[PDB]
Amino acid sequence: IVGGYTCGANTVPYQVSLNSGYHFCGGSLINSQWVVSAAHCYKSGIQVRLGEDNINVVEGNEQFISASKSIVHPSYNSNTLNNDIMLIKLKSAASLNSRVASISLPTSCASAGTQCLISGWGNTKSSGTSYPDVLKCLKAPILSDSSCKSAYPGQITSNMFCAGYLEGGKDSCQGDSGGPVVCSGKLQGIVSWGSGCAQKNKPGVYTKVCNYVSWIKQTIASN
Numbered sequence: 337i338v339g340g341y342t343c344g345a346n347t348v349p350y351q352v353s354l355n356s357g358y359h360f361c362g363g364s365l366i367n368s369q370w371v372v373s374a375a376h377c378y379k380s381g382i383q384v385r386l387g388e389d390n391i392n393v394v395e396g397n398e399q400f401i402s403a404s405k406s407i408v409h410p411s412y413n414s415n416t417l418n419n420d421i422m423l424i425k426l427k428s429a430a431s432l433n434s435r436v437a438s439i440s441l442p443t444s445c446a447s448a449g450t451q452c453l454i455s456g457w458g459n460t461k462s463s464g465t466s467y468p469d470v471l472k473c474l475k476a477p478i479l480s481d482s483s484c485k486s487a488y489p490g491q492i493t494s495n496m497f498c499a500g501y502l503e504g505g506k507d508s509c510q511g512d513s514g515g516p517v518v519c520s521g522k523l524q525g526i527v528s529w530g531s532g533c534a535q536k537n538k539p540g541v542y543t544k545v546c547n548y549v550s551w552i553k554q555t556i557a558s559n
C-alpha cells in the first residue's frame with residue numbers, strides 16, 4: 337500500500353496473509369473455513385495466517401492453518417486477469433473472535449464514489465522498494481466504469497473496477513495482491529492489478545466480487 341497508514345493491530349480482522357515460506361499475497365476470511373484471494377495468487381503449499389499484525393513477530397493472536405484445497409475460478413484468464421478470484425479451503429476451522437473475524441459477501445454491487453478500505457503488506461513506494469512488517473490501510477473511492485476504461489483502454493471487463501485517485505499518490509502495490517477491498521461492510525473487491533503503483537491516471541484495478549457470489553456459494557456448498 338502506497339500512501340496509506342498503519343491500520344492498527346487486528347483492526348482489519350478478516351485480513352489474511354498467504355505464506356509459502358514468506359508472505360506473498362493477501363486474502364479475506366469469508367467464514368470459518370474459507371478464504372477469498374486472487375487467482376493470480378495461486379501456488380501450491382499455502383499456509384493461511386490469520387490474526388496477523390506484524391508478519392515477522394509472533395504477537396499472540398495468530399492462527400496458522402494450512403490450505404487443504406485451492407480453487408481458481410473456472411474462467412480465470414491469466415493473460416487478461418479476467419475472473420481473478422480463487423477460494424482457499426482451510427484444513428481446520430478458524431476460531432472467530434474480535435482479532436479474527438469473517439467479512440460478509442455482497443448481496444449487491446457497490447456504488448461508484450463509495451469509500452472503501454484496502455489493506456495489505458505490499459510495497460509502500462511507487463518508485464523503489466520498501467515492504468512493511470505491520471498491516472497497512474488505505475481509504476479509496478470506487479471510480480466510474482468510464483474513468484476506469486479511459487485509464488486502461490481495451491483492458492477493463494465487467495468483472496473489474498477501479499478504485500483510488502487519478503492524481504496518484506495512493507494505491508495498492510506489489511504484495512497486496514489478493515487482499516480485500518471492503519465497502520459498507522462487504523467484501524466488494526480483491527486487489528488484482530494496475531500499472532505500477534500510485535501513478536497519475538493509473539488507479540488500481542480490483543476483481544468485482546459481487547459478480548462471483550453465486551459461484552462462491554455453490555463452491556462452498558460442495559467443498
Ligand SMILES: c1cnc2c(c1)ccc1cccnc12
Nearest residue numbers: 360361376377511513528529
Ligand atoms: C504475487 C503478488 N502479486 C502478483 C503475483 C504474485 C502474480 C501475478 C500478479 C499479477 C498482477 C498483480 N500482482 C501479481
Ligand SMILES: [Ca+2]
Nearest residue numbers: 390393394395
Ligand atoms: Ca505476527
Ligand SMILES: [O]
Nearest residue numbers: 509510511513
Ligand atoms: O503484484
Ligand SMILES: [V+3]
Nearest residue numbers: 510511512513
Ligand atoms: V501483486
